[PDB]
Amino acid sequence: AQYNQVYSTDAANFEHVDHYLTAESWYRPKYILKDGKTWTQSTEKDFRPLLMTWWPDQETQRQYVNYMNAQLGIHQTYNTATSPLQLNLAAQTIQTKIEEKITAEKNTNWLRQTISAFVKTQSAWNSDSEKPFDDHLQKGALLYSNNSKLTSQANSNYRILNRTPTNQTGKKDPRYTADRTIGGYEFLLANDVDNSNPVVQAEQLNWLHFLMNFGNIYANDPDANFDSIRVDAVDNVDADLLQIAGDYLKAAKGIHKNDKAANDHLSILEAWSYNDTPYLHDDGDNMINMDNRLRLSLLYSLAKPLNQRSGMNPLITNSLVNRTDDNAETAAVPSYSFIRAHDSEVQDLIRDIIKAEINPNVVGYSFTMEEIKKAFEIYNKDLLATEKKYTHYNTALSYALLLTNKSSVPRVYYGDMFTDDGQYMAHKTINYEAIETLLKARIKYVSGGQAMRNQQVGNSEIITSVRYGKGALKATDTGDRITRTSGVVVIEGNNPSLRLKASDRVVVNMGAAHKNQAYRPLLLTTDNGIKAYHSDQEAAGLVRYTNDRGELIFTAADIKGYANPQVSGYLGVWVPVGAAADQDVRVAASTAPSTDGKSVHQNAALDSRVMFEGFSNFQAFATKKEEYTNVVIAKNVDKFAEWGVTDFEMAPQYVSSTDGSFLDSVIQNGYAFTDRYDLGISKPNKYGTADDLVKAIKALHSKGIKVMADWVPDQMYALPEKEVVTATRVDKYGTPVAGSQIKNTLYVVDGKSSGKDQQAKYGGAFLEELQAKYPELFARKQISTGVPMDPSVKIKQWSAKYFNGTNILGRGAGYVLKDQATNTYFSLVSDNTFLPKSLVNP
Ligand SMILES: [Ca+2]
Secondary structure, three states: OOOOOEOOOOHHHEOOEOOEOEOOOEEOEOEEEHHHOOEEEOOOOOOEEHHHOOOOOHHHHHHHHHHHHHHOOOOOOOOOOOOHHHHHHHHHHHHHHHHHHHHHOOOOOOHHHHHHHHHHHOHHHOHHHHOOOOOOOOOOEEEEOOOOOOOHHHOOOOOOOOOOOOOOOOOOOOOOOOOOOOOOOOOOOOEEEOOOOHHHHHHHHHHHHHHOOHHHHHHOOHHHOOOEEEEOOHHHOOOHHHHHHHHHHHHHHOOOOEHHHHHOOOOEEOOOOOOHHHHHHHOOOOOEEEOHHHHHHHHHHHHOOHHHOOOOOHHHHOOOOOOOEEOOOOOOOOEEEOOOOOOOOOHHHHHHHHHHHOOOOOOOOOOOHHHHHHHHHHHHHHHHOOOOOOOOOOHHHHHHHHOOOOOOEEEEEHHHOEOOOOOOOOOEOOOHHHHHHHHHHHHHHOOOOEEEEEEEEOOEEEEEEEEOOOOOOOOOOOOOHHHHOOOEEEEEEOOOOOOOOOOOOEEEEOOOOOOOOEEEEEEEEOOOOEEEOOOOHHHHHHOEEOOOOOEEEEOOOOOOOEEOOOOEEEEEEEEEOOOOOOOOOOOOOOOOEOOOOOOOOOOHHHHOOOEEEOOOOOOOOOOOHHHOHHHHHHHOHHHHHHHOOOEEEOOOOOOEOOOOOOHHHOOOOOOOEOOOOOOOOOOOEOOEOHHHHHHHHHHHHHOOOEEEEEEOOOEEOOOOEEEEEEEEEEOOOOOEOOOOOOOOEEEEEEEEOOOOOHHHHHOOOOHHHHHHHOHHHHHOOOOOOOOOOOOOOOOOOOOHHHEEEEEOOOOOOOOEOEEOOOOEEOEOOHHHOEOOHHHHOO
């Protein structure tokens, strides 16, 4: 009893977390039985495990012997009936065996680990006590208490949950009713940063300013700054951040002054709710959101299996813009449009394949490397099939619409041109040719008003989409020479069974600048795929003409249904003959002052832009310098210019954590990180070193292309230090879970950064200069909080007080040790020390 008791009650003598004890705590006894033979004075070296001498109750002390008796090849176990006098010799005999064996392996590392193992067999100490699970992607979350006496350094006056755009004020906005929900939820993955905390808000701003000045700050090269941002996971953070970022863009860059300034820094949100667009629009169009309705329209009218496909009309009317006749010089609301992204309609399809053909109980997207590579074999083959079971149909049809549509900036996804897996840019998809063709055509032909028509012919239907030519917003505008040699027509059908009757005609009005004119093909579907024409000359054979009225006319000879690996339906695209090799109908943004109170205007100059999402989650890791993405990017900067890419959306560049607790930290895309400022600085990121990054930003600038920084304020992964928090089990809205055991109960999280990383170096480092240069930013009272940001304290080190909570860690409800008698946590704070009766007073 005696020797074992604690050496001294100092914090010094125990391994503790915020002065609390855990099941895995080691400490300094007064003596060590040396080689289980002789009672020698401890030194600051002789640390043992608590569990070696103390148990939270007798039932646990029992298991421990049984378990331990196993390990030490002691051949005796005890069932529930056992006295405690035997439970007490059982552990003393083990204790000798423990020293004897430490002497023998000259170490205790092996113990560290028999201990750690055992701890995990107990309910109070594993994920058993953390049930019931909920539908958080990592199975559950813990909300940290704002007011706990036990964990005062984790207290917060904030932690205001769920203030999405729709719900920013804590009530659902009456203004936006397309989404009838509250438009998002707080807890998405990992450690959830509390973005309602004014100090944290200021820190998000610091980081924004940093990214946007990355060149100057890191390389001293004004030519290497990110030009613009994406706000990630908008519907999972506090929407004040939208005001802050827009306020910034305004103050620092002048985006509200004129279009040229707004388009040099054109920024986007990833905001899934239908409410978010009108919300953004009332906010002043300081950034643009995706057109989610059009995305769904493409997906269901074009990309789904033949039996699940819907009719085509939504391709015209289910959108931010009704494209039946779109003749506005400036659209009501700006947006960007896409059909796939790094996550959307890619990692889903892999999940579909794993869940179907590999591991049926796979959770969320928590995949393994193994499963994935296995998944990819199936997927890649499905890509080449005519009958697809897992992957998109009609990719080229979707791009034809996206790249010819008026009133939205198209975003092309990397993985629709290159293989989603695979070294960067090494392999082309079968659609690369058609997409590149469309991209090139867009620069040269795509300008003017738009008309879309849905026509029931033969046994099915087609839609026709028409751009009138540069300088004709309406069908009746005759324009000038360049109008005449610009414009385009797209014809599409979504049913392989489409047959026209002999008497059918599809009559397309091309616009008044196009009477009696030659047209030639750009893309035509063929039995095996799609044939691309790279020049008039190339398509010399297949010319057709409009008539007196400027109508093209199409017939059964032109239009029928196909099924091949690229087309399930019909695609045809025609362009006028005679465009100068170097014709370009894009249009530069005006310096004329903006006057409608909005920053971004969806006009012809904005339509002239094209966005490129330049990565895939599932890219292979580089084998060598040459294969690093950012290296490869700098080296093909010309292609991007040739495609008319004006905004290059780089992947997040933060060094990835490697915990594997979610997809993002398995394929290391850059959304899972521990250091916000570590852009390939401490070691390379998936995409190269900080220098490769700097070089790729420079390369893209040299072509005049803009580069977007993914701004990811929602969460952080794998913090290095432990902290104790008062936690509660909650669902993703922060509501307490029914039937859980963790309710204002102490928990051990990984919630502290190292205080020695880049964050330590740059955190809050620019606040002072920001307040001098842009006092207006700090004057705003943020919506959710009612108060201004708080730059008066810098964040050099993240700790739990800056977080809402975390995903569940499997440590258990009882990990932090409590005297079950008094039901009170043990503590090592000095004026109030409380230890287990046996270790201090035996
Ligand atoms: Ca959040």
